[PDB]
Amino acid sequence: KETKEVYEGEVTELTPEDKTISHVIVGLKSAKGTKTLRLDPTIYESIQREKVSIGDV
Amino acid sequence: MKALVEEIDKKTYNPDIYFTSLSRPVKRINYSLADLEARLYT
Amino acid sequence: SRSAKAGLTFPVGRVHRLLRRGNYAQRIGSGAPVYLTAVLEYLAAEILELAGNAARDNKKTRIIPRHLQLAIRNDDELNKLLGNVTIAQGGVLPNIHQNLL
Amino acid sequence: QSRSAKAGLTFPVGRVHRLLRRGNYAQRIGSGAPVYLTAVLEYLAAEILELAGNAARDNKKTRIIPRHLQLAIRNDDELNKLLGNVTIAQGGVLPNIHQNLLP
Amino acid sequence: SKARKETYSSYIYKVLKQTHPDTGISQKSMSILNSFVNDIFERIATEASKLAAYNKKSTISAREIQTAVRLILPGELAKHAVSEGTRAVTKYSSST
Amino acid sequence: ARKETYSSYIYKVLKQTHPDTGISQKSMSILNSFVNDIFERIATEASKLAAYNKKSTISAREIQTAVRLILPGELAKHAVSEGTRAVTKYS
Amino acid sequence: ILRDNIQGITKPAIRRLARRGGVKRISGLIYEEVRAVLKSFLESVIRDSVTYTEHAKRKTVTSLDVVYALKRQGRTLYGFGG
Amino acid sequence: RDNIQGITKPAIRRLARRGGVKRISGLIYEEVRAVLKSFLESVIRDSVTYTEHAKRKTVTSLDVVYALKRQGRTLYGFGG
Amino acid sequence: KPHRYKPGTVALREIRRFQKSTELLIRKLPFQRLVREIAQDFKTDLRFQSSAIGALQESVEAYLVSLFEDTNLAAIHAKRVTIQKKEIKLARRLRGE
Amino acid sequence: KPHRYKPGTVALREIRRFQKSTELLIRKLPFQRLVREIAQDFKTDLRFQSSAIGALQESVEAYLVSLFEDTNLAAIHAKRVTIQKKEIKLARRLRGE
């Protein structure tokens, strides 16, 4: 038995932090909330693989 | 282990400046007049 | 006296008689002047140690009212406790504004 | 007959005298002090009653709302200087309009 | 379910009938007047207690109420309150 | 004539805390005004707090909640701890 | 109920309270600063309310607890529970 | 006759130096003199009140300290 | 031809409208959950009467009105019509807080 | 070659000079005739002790010092170094007077 965290939302900004080694803050706009999160370069590389843009769930 | 996902604010968080913090205790305050005037005039 | 067996310095009979003749209530308990001498002894010991260290800062073996003024005003709980109290011959704090420099 | 009618008072002397006895103020209480206190409280209460009464007469109402008492207290200088921190519930504020904000 | 409570309803209604016997008073403003008389009672009572404690005396007379009213009130309210108070007291003591 | 002050008690607590530094007479009068003022503070708050509960008896409960209400939480915390320690050690 | 009830005070409510005070134009940080002053004020009164409620051996706060709580602070709130 | 002018302008200048004021205009001495004129009436009137209640012809230090007691100022030092 | 007011007109009639009203401008339920929210971490499982809530809301409303009047005069001293954060810190600090 | 200071130097050393001194800045005789002058029209033929005059002068001096500090911060809020009459009315009115 194990618990896992689930994140989802509409992508608002894909931008480095302010200075960098290339990480990307992904601002996920959900319905009931808006939060920004910082990710690893590998999951950001898969984000570049999925060909997402501004406004994709 | 190392979390690949990190929640972060836009205004409060900066990637460069990282800061972490937590009979009667009382901070030490110098009652010297020349120390306070020496601090305020430098 | 009952101050030495309880670890007190201020007398219990003077405070108990002052509460009796001070027109506060009809019945007066026995632990209330002991509690009052405990609180007044702790607070007076606090002003004595803060004014004592404030006298130790300026290299003087006597307590002037300026040492008590800086000892009270430099503490946050003493300034919040007594904000309207005017101390004679205590002076003011060396507060210099930054924009006037 | 109570001693309020022979002295020209409305508030009772026995309730104020007993309240001063059981209020833990002093050991000995005089006899003219509750009469003086009912005189001062009767004059002041009559003052608020006539000022709030005329303030109720200004807005053409036969009942005293707390706004009439609020304007009656705040419009007087001695009542504002006497009570400056007193907050009146459902009394509103004064129509204070600044001159520089006008076009 | 209620035993008894004390208020100034009939007295404020009687002075109301003495000043302007047309305008009525609501219950909430009557409670505000009850808080007013109950507050000023503690004001002149507490000032009489401290003023009696300052003179090293255990007796509260009309002198302490007179100088207490003269010290905690403006000169108009203390002047007319001192005049009407001394008038009611000296008119009271003349009956005997 | 006689007068009452806290000179020997403040001198004794002075000898208990730091028995080197002396105290002037004027600052001793300021401390006398301080203890004489806070005595009227906790005494008056005990009188009004005893009057609020419709009781004619002032106990250590009224001094405890009075000290807890008129002081900040540090001074009321250590004053309540040392006060209950002195009272429970006394009884 | 237990999570961020400080945001329940709306911005047009602070705008109406600014209209009561005679304010013409209102900037951005006024609602946050007024919300912070209200947040300190409700602790400053409510803490004394829990103090008198704990001393009164009661589990329910009454009007005498609020009026007597504001009595020692010099505010002397009349009206309800005088 | 006009003892209110006894307070000199360099005295108010020194009291401005105690408060951290750099430059002082012209009406500051008149406004400060008026505030002091109202203040001495506001304290001295209560001093004559307590002196008249005390059945005394001489004002003492307890009259001044007890006069400033009810106003919340609580002046310590002389006559505490 | 649309009919619009110039900026500065509706604020004056809002002053004339709300300054004649003695009603409360804050709703009962967010103030209820706010009072219970501050009362949560002090003492658990408390109760509140039907009274003593409009007293806190009344003193909060009138005290905030007087604070907006003193802060409004502080913004008047700055020779402008806009209220700023330093006006709230100025009028808050100069009142003895 | 005369030696003169620039405007703004002697005020700072006057602050350093007087802020280290606890002496009274008002003389005893104009305050004496002033106190007797206010005491003339209240009660005729009064007496004053040798004490209770430096208490009024001490509370007047320290209260005027705190009023000059609050008025000085009020002039600091106006983004200038000069004190004005509206600063005294502002810092006087905002303290509850």
In terms of topology, how is this protein built?
This is part of a larger assembly, with 1 copy of chain A (57 residues), 1 copy of chain B (42 residues), 2 copies of chain C, 2 copies of chain E, 2 copies of chain G and 2 copies of chain I (97 residues).
Chain C (H helix, E strand, L loop, with lengths): L1 H4 L6 H9 L6 E2 L3 H26 L4 E2 L1 H9 L2 H6 L20
Chain E lengths: L8 H11 L4 E2 L1 H28 L4 E2 L1 H11 L2 H19 L3
Chain G lengths: L10 H10 L4 E2 L3 H26 L4 E2 L1 H7 L13
Helix pairs in contact in G: 2-3
Function (chain B): Participates in the catalytic exchange of histone H2A for the H2A variant HZT1, an euchromatin-specific factor, leading to chromatin remodeling and changes in transcription of targeted genes. Indirectly involved in vacuolar protein sorting.
Subcellular location (chain B): Nucleus
Subunit structure (chain B): Belongs to the SWR1 complex at least composed of ACT1, ARP4, RVB1, RVB2, ARP6, YAF9, VPS71, VPS72, SWC3, SWC4, SWC5, SWR1 and HTZ1.
Explained architecture:
The structure is cut from a larger assembly and holds 1 copy of chain A (57 residues), 1 copy of chain B (42 residues), 2 copies of chain C, 2 copies of chain E, 2 copies of chain G and 2 copies of chain I (97 residues). With 57 residues, chain A is α+β, with helices and mostly antiparallel strands. Chain A has 1 helix and 3 strands; from the N terminus they run E-E-E-H. Helix content of chain A is 16%, strand content 30%. With 42 residues, chain B is α+β, with helices and mostly antiparallel strands. Chain B has one helix at 33-40, and one strand at 5-7. The radius of gyration of chain B is 20 Å and the shape is elongated. Chain E has a single domain, classed as Histone, subunit A. Chain E is 72% helix and 4% strand. Chain E is built from 4 helices and 2 strands. Classes of the chains: A alpha+beta (57), B alpha+beta (42), C mainly alpha (101), E mainly alpha (96), G mainly alpha (82), I mainly alpha (97). Chains in contact: A-B, B-C, C-D, C-F, C-H, C-J, D-E, D-G, D-I, E-G, E-H, F-G, F-H, G-I, H-J, I-J.
